[PDB]
Amino acid sequence: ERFPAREFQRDLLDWFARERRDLPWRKDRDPYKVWVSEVMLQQTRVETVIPYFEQFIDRFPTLEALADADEDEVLKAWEGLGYYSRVRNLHAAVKEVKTRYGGKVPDDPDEFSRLKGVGPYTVGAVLSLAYGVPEPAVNGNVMRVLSRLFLVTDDIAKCSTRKRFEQIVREIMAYENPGAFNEALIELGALVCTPRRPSCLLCPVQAYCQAFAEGVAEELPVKMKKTAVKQVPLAVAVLADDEGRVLIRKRDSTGLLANLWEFPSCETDGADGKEKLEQMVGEQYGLQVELTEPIVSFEHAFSHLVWQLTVFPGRLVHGGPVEEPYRLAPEDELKAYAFPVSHQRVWREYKEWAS
DNA sequence: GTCCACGTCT
DNA sequence: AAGACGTGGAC
Numbered sequence: 001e002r003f004p005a006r007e008f009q010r011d012l013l014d015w016f017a018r019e020r021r022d023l024p025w026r027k028d029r030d031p032y033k034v035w036v037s038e039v040m041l042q043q044t045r046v047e048t049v050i051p052y053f054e055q056f057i058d059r060f061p062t063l064e065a066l067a068d069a070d071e072d073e074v075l076k077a078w079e080g081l082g083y084y085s086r087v088r089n090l091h092a093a094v095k096e097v098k099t100r101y102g103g104k105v106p107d108d109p110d111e112f113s114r115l116k117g118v119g120p121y122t123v124g125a126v127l128s129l130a131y132g133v134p135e136p137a138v139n140g141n142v143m144r145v146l147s148r149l150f151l152v153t154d155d156i157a158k159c160s161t162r163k164r165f166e167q168i169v170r171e172i173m174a175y176e177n178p179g180a181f182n183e184a185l186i187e188l189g190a191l192v193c194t195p196r197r198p199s200c201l202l203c204p205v206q207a208y209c210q211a212f213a214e215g216v217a218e219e220l221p222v223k224m225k226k227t228a229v230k231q232v233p234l235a236v237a238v239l240a241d242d243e244g245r246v247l248i249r250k251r252d253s254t255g256l257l258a259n260l261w262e263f264p265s266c267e268t269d270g271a272d273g274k275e276k277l278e279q280m281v282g283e284q285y286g287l288q289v290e291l292t293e294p295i296v297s298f299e300h301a302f303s304h305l306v307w308q309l310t311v312f313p314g315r316l317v318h319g320g321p322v323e324e325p326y327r328l329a330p331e332d333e334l335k336a337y338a339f340p341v342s343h344q345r346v347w348r349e350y351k352e353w354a355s
Numbered sequence: 356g357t358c359c360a361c362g363t364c365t
Numbered sequence: 366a367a368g369a370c371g372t373g374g375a376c
């Protein structure tokens with residue numbers, strides 16, 4: 001608001017220029033490359049992302065190349081990062097850019113914001129870093145920093161609250177170098193102004209911070225500690241040939257873990273067991289199996305639910321037509337398919353049990 | 356174990 | 366709105 005913004009900016013950027021970290025997506029400011037990195041970093045920590053970004057870009061060097069890829073290739077590249085919709089949207093958006101915008105990522109916030117997977121944070125991030133457009137790039141990190149600097153006690157969960165912080169950015173932003181400013185802000189929240197025990201002693205902008213002066217940084221920002229989970233018990237069948245082929249299946253185009261492959265499963269609700277599994281299997285494609293007592297139970301967390309998995313090894317005797325989205329996959333071909341992490345562990349637990 | 360990441364869409 | 370949508374880095 002009021003506020004010595006000009007020198008705040010000089011302190012922040014001075015720090016950022018010096019203390020800046022080595023990240024592959026910083027090695028240049030190609031809008032495609034920048035855009036990929038910001039999609040990968042969504043709800044994902046920087047260290048996690050680094051090898052993904054490197055492999056992805058290596059496999060899909062240009063915007064054009066991502067557009068020409070089969071959806072499944074792109075999914076496999078994303079295997080493990082989570083929030084798999086991001087990659088379906090990125091793929092789609094890049095096709096639109098190739099057709100509608102002739103391969104070049106739009107530097108107008110409205111054109112860009114209309115693309116799939118691109119929300120307000122990503123508009124600011126990508127366009128400021130890659131094009132110097134002075135849009136705010138407000139995310140969790142920035143709101144933490146700003147909530148502390150200006151002692152803003154709004155629930156960081158409310159839709160309206162990001163808009164409040166964006167306005168604060170608009171006011172204090174350094175329009176000379178919006179990209180640098182934006183990233184500095186973000187990287188400060190990321191490395192220094194951390195959720196617990198921020199490193200205020202080392203903070204380039206300590207002198208401007210109200211939270212610090214009032215000794216309340218650690219009770220900011222305010223966010224609902226939001227409860228629940230929903231536990232979801234789930235039986236999983238790892239069924240093999242005499243021939244080494246394994247029965248796997250492809251999840252639906254939408255909903256949870258869209259288009260990923262899995263070992264066949266169903267929700268046991270209680271913990272009755274392989275019975276429903278045996279029924280499944282049978283009820284589908286002929287298929288008579290002999291399931292043989294669970295080899296492991298383990299939990300697997302999603303943001304909005306937990307799978308309680310129990311995995312049943314089993315043997316196959318045949319099944320007229322296995323069709324639909326099911327498949328008999330030779331063991332050595334399992335690596336070609338994209339599995340959610342849950343089922344990669346299912347397979348790991350399984351392959352172990354039968355050394 | 357907990358928290359929440361360089362959030363978006365509905 | 367408020368809830369769906371994955372996973373692990375860093376404590």
Ligand code: SF4
Pocket residue numbers: 145148149192193194198199200201203204205206209210211212217
């Ligand atoms: S002083 Fe402490 S709280 Fe204020 S910005 Fe720097 S790190 Fe965050």
